[PDB]
Amino acid sequence: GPSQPTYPGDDAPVEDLIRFYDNLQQYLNVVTRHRY
Amino acid sequence: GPSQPTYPGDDAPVEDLIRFYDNLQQYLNVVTRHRY
């Protein structure tokens, strides 16, 4: 659902950043409902 | 370039989250070079 994605940190490795990217993808998909 | 994207905050509005999404898109595009 509209789960607020957790931010690992600034020094987070690119893999976890990919994770955050996908988690933001899901979150944004939900909250924006593709209105951007 | 590989500019480390700035994190606005947890309560950041979805627009700025879109911004961070695109900034992460650029950053990840660079650093991963599409290897994910």
CSV table of C-alpha atoms in Angstrom, one decimal:
chain,number,residue,atom,x,y,z
A,1,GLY,CA,0.0,0.0,0.0
A,2,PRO,CA,1.1,3.6,0.6
A,3,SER,CA,3.9,2.5,2.8
A,4,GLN,CA,6.3,5.4,3.6
A,5,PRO,CA,9.7,4.1,2.4
A,6,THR,CA,12.6,4.0,4.9
A,7,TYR,CA,15.7,6.0,4.1
A,8,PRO,CA,18.8,3.8,4.8
A,9,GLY,CA,21.2,6.7,4.9
A,10,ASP,CA,23.4,9.0,2.8
A,11,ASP,CA,26.2,6.5,2.5
A,12,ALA,CA,23.8,3.8,1.6
A,13,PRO,CA,25.1,1.4,-1.1
A,14,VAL,CA,23.7,1.7,-4.6
A,15,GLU,CA,21.9,-1.6,-4.2
A,16,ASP,CA,19.9,-0.3,-1.2
A,17,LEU,CA,19.4,2.9,-3.2
A,18,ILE,CA,17.9,0.7,-5.9
A,19,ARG,CA,15.7,-0.7,-3.2
A,20,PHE,CA,14.7,2.8,-2.2
A,21,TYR,CA,14.1,3.7,-5.8
A,22,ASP,CA,11.7,0.8,-6.2
A,23,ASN,CA,10.1,1.4,-2.9
A,24,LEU,CA,9.6,5.1,-3.9
A,25,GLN,CA,8.3,3.8,-7.3
A,26,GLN,CA,5.6,1.8,-5.5
A,27,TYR,CA,4.8,4.6,-3.0
A,28,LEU,CA,4.7,7.3,-5.7
A,29,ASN,CA,2.6,5.0,-7.9
A,30,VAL,CA,0.1,4.7,-5.1
A,31,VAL,CA,0.1,8.3,-3.8
A,32,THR,CA,0.3,10.1,-7.2
A,33,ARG,CA,-1.8,7.5,-9.0
A,34,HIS,CA,0.2,8.4,-12.1
A,35,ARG,CA,-0.6,12.1,-12.1
A,36,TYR,CA,2.9,13.5,-12.8
B,1,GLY,CA,27.1,13.8,-13.3
B,2,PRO,CA,27.1,11.5,-10.3
B,3,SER,CA,25.7,14.2,-8.0
B,4,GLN,CA,24.6,12.7,-4.7
B,5,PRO,CA,20.9,13.6,-4.4
B,6,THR,CA,19.8,15.7,-1.4
B,7,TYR,CA,17.1,14.2,0.8
B,8,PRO,CA,14.4,16.9,1.6
B,9,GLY,CA,12.9,15.0,4.6
B,10,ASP,CA,10.5,12.3,5.7
B,11,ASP,CA,7.5,14.7,5.6
B,12,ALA,CA,8.6,15.9,2.1
B,13,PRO,CA,5.6,16.5,-0.3
B,14,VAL,CA,5.1,14.0,-3.1
B,15,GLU,CA,6.2,16.6,-5.6
B,16,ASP,CA,9.6,16.9,-4.0
B,17,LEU,CA,9.6,13.1,-3.7
B,18,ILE,CA,9.1,13.0,-7.5
B,19,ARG,CA,12.1,15.3,-7.7
B,20,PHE,CA,14.1,12.9,-5.5
B,21,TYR,CA,12.9,10.0,-7.7
B,22,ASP,CA,14.2,11.7,-10.8
B,23,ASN,CA,17.4,12.8,-9.1
B,24,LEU,CA,17.9,9.2,-8.0
B,25,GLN,CA,17.0,8.1,-11.5
B,26,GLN,CA,19.9,10.2,-12.9
B,27,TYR,CA,22.3,9.3,-10.1
B,28,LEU,CA,21.6,5.6,-10.4
B,29,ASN,CA,21.7,5.8,-14.2
B,30,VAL,CA,25.2,7.1,-13.8
B,31,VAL,CA,26.6,5.0,-10.9
B,32,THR,CA,25.0,1.7,-12.0
B,33,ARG,CA,25.4,2.4,-15.7
B,34,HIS,CA,22.2,0.2,-16.1
B,35,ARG,CA,23.6,-2.9,-14.4
B,36,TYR,CA,20.6,-3.8,-12.2
